[PDB]
Amino acid sequence: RKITQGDDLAPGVLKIVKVYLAVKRRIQPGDKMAGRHGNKGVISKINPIEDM
Amino acid sequence: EANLRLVISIAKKYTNRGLQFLDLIQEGNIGLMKAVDKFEYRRGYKFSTYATWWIRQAITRSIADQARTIRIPVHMIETINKLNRISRQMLQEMGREPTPEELAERMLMPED
Amino acid sequence: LEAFVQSGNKPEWMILTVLPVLPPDLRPLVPLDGGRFATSDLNDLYRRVINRNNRLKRLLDLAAPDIIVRNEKRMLQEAVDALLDNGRRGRAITGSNKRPLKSLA
Secondary structure (H helix, E strand, O other): OOOOOOOOOOOOOOOOOOOOOOOOOOOOOOOEEEOOOOOEEEOOOOOOOOOO | OOOHHHHHHHHHHHOOOOOOOOHHHHHHHHHHHHHHHOOOOOOOOOHHHHHHHHHHHHHHHHHHOOOOOOOOOOHHHHHHHHHHHHHHHHHHHOOOOOOHHHHHHHHOOOOO | OHHHHHHOOOHHHHOOOOOOOOOHHHOOOOEOOOOOEOOOOOOHHHHHHHHHHHHHHHHHHOOOOHHHHHHHHHHHHHHHHHHHHOEOOOEOOEOOOOOEOOOOO
16 A cells, blocks of 8 residues: 555546556667767667678 | 733734734734723733734634635635534544545545 | 938827727637637736726726825836836746746837
């Protein structure tokens, strides 16, 4: 009964509802990268292993 | 004119951020008109007591339903404030958060 | 004065006797689903002006002590000029979360 607990939601609200999302924000271009020594910048293409 | 100071000492109590530090004094100065018109000194009693009743509630009503967004028959205005007055027990006797379920015993009545 | 003559102005317009009122849809009065209302700023500033002016009226309508009329004139000009350009009159009109209210200016 911290789950089955209720709380007032002020005069104007009988009930409230929620959902949470595990958003798998994958590796992609336009996203940002860096290293420890102050190099900071955008991922500007993904290259085949030989395109390198 | 003879009572313009007694209007401040009563009104300034209620001006405590209530809506503004000022305006309730000038509404008390108009409640004072009904008081000066019905001043029954012929009962025996004094204008101090007259002001403590009538002019005090003219000062109360000056921002109870006047100057609001909303206005109702007055029993249904100040009853919302009976609940806020009662909440002074709730916030220390249940004493961690407020609960309408406690207010139901403190009012002997159903929530709806 | 030459600019008044060449453009159609009149000096009475310095010292007005009528406040025009901002149309509600520019301060959009509506209710909200949370049982609360669009009461913001450009509405509430007019509540304070309406109240002060409705006292000044009643005080003249009853021929009250001129003290109460003189104070309510000063309070009415305070509220009109703060509705026009809040803060600029060496003071501002405010609400419980300490802030000033947004003026017409």
